[PDB]
């Protein structure tokens, strides 16, 4: 199956309260494996998964040096962007960066990403061609023209097409038993009377991996998407995820509604009925 | 628009002295490096910095110190100079790979054990041969700078107050006057060719200038000679119809 690696960067300015706070996390598929915080104590890249601890101290020294380098880069970018937008010198602002590569079942480069943001809005983004940039506002074109003259697209493509996929494949083999496994959902249904005339049927999905899951109610085959309460897929804290779905029912029509669980860990889609 | 500058550009020091070399970039680059070029090793990283305030070690960091007080300035401090620190030092700036590392002009540092071997050059200009003018209708001038140590000198030709670059060529390497001796005094030569009609004009003034880089003001001189400071030694020759 198609696997992924993606790093997330967050740099928040603290005007007068210190230096910008840099938080960095790395996610192979849906499993975090590295972490760095500038306001921490270790001041080092730290593992967050068992299959990455097997890497040598050299890995944990080069990753610490390289991830710290982006903290310095975003520090100056924070003031550069403040001037572009003419914001106050005492206000806090956030720069967010997402980049990563995608391999296929074979292990070959499928596609790569690079997206930057400012204050929760898009700023600049590397296109799919890995050769051109897309700016969102007129101040991001300042960055684009600078980055187009520095051939940043070439340099970023050299990582996404090279070092990225190389180490993603390495990470996948280091944790075969944890990354290339699928945990099917543990499904059950519950029934809560709202009154003596109505009730709430909830369809549950517990401890499943990965995150992608589709839960749908049907009334004699007709979808009930309009009359349904859906919650965001949420983590359990142990690497698996949770999701439950509710529908309000008449008193004596609980056996007309069916829940359908779709997940790649299930060889055949489940059908739950009360 | 790459602007990486270096100061000093030429410097003589003594074993045990402090030499602080400075670099200045104006290209908003967070990464700055201090290299050192010697024959057989190419460029070798001494120290480098990933940002303002940080200073990290390289591959040959022993005997050297570094300081990054701002994003624009990066210094290399040679606290206790050794003769093995005689090299050409290059400073570079870049942006975390990074299409190009932009290099500075480079500093020629020659660490000596004693300043008593430092001598300014003696310069003389030699007028063209009449045989050359008759045979080839071109006039060649030869300028010799002899008896200078250390080797960093800079020879230039000045025709009527303007520095010229056509028909000018200088020996790539100074040659030793006594190659057997250590601390041997060097010699350098240069050529300047112009048309025979140009040389026959007496109103044209030809001057050979040799910039010698030696002792600075703060250096202490104790010998009974002239303090061989960084100076200029020239020799002149006038055109003649003969």
């Amino acid at each position: 199956g198609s696997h992924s690696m993606r790093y997330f960067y967050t740099s928040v300015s603290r005007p007068g309260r210190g230096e910008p706070r840099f938080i960095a996390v790395g996610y192979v598929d849906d499993t975090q494996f590295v972490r760095f915080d500038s306001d921490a104590a270790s001041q080092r890249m730290e593992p967050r998964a068992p299959w990455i601890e097997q890497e040598g101290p050299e890995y944990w020294d080069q990753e610490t040096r390289n991830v710290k380098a982006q903290s310095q880069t975003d520090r100056v970018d924070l003031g550069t962007l403040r001037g572009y937008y003419n914001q106050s010198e005492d206000g806090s602002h956030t720069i967010q960066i997402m980049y990563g590569c995608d391999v296929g079942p074979d292990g070959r480069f499928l596609r790569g990403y690079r997206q930057d943001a400012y204050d929760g809005k898009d700023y600049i983004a590397l296109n799919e061609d890995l050769r051109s940039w897309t700016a969102a506002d007129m101040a991001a074109q300042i960055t684009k023209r600078k980055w187009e003259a520095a051939h940043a697209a070439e340099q970023q493509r050299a990582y996404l097409e090279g070092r990225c996929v190389e180490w993603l494949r390495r990470y996948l083999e280091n944790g075969k038993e944890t990354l290339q496994r699928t945990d099917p959902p543990k499904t059950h249904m519950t029934h809560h009377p709202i009154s003596d005339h109505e009730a709430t049927l909830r369809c549950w999905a517990l401890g499943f991996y990965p995150a992608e899951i589709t839960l749908t109610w049907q009334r004699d085959g007709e979808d009930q998407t309009q009359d349904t309460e859906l919650v965001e897929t949420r983590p359990a804290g142990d690497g698996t995820f949770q999701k439950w779905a509710a529908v309000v029912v008449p008193s004596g029509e609980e056996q007309r509604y069916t829940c359908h669980v779709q997940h790649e860990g299930l060889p055949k889609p489940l059908t739950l009925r009360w | 628009e790459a602007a990486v500058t270096q100061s000093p550009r030429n410097k003589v020091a003594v074993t045990g002295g402090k030499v602080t070399l400075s670099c200045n970039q104006t290209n908003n680059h967070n990464n700055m490096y201090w290299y050192r070029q010697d024959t057989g090793h190419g460029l070798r990283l001494i120290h480098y910095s990933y940002g303002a305030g940080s200073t990290e070690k390289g591959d040959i960091p022993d005997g050297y110190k570094a300081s990054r007080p701002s994003q624009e300035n990066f210094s290399l401090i040679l606290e206790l100079a050794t003769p093995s620190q005689t090299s050409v030092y290059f400073c570079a700036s870049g942006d975390f790979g990074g299409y190009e590392q932009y290099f500075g002009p480079g500093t020629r540092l020659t660490v000596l054990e004693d300043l008593k071997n430092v001598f300014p050059p003696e310069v003389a200009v030699f007028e063209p041969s009449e045989a050359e003018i008759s045979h080839t209708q071109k006039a060649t001038l030869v300028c010799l700078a002899t008896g200078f140590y250390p080797d960093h000198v800079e020879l230039s030709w000045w025709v009527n107050g303007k520095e010229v670059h056509s028909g000018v060529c200088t020996d790539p390497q100074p040659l030793k006057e006594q190659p057997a001796l250590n601390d041997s005094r060097y010699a350098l030569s240069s050529r300047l060719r112009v048309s025979a009609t140009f040389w026959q004009n007496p109103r044209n003034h030809f001057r050979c200038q040799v910039q010698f880089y030696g002792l600075s003001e703060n250096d202490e001189w104790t010998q009974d000679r002239a303090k061989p400071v960084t100076q200029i030694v020239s020799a002149e020759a006038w055109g003649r119809a003969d």
């Binding site: 960095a24 080069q62 975003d74 980055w147 990225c164 | 975390f96």
Partner: peptide, 9 residues
């Protein structure tokens, strides 16, 4: 591994 090209923004 980390490979975000920083070039000034």
């Amino acid at each position: 591994v980390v490979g975000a090209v920083g070039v000034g923004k």
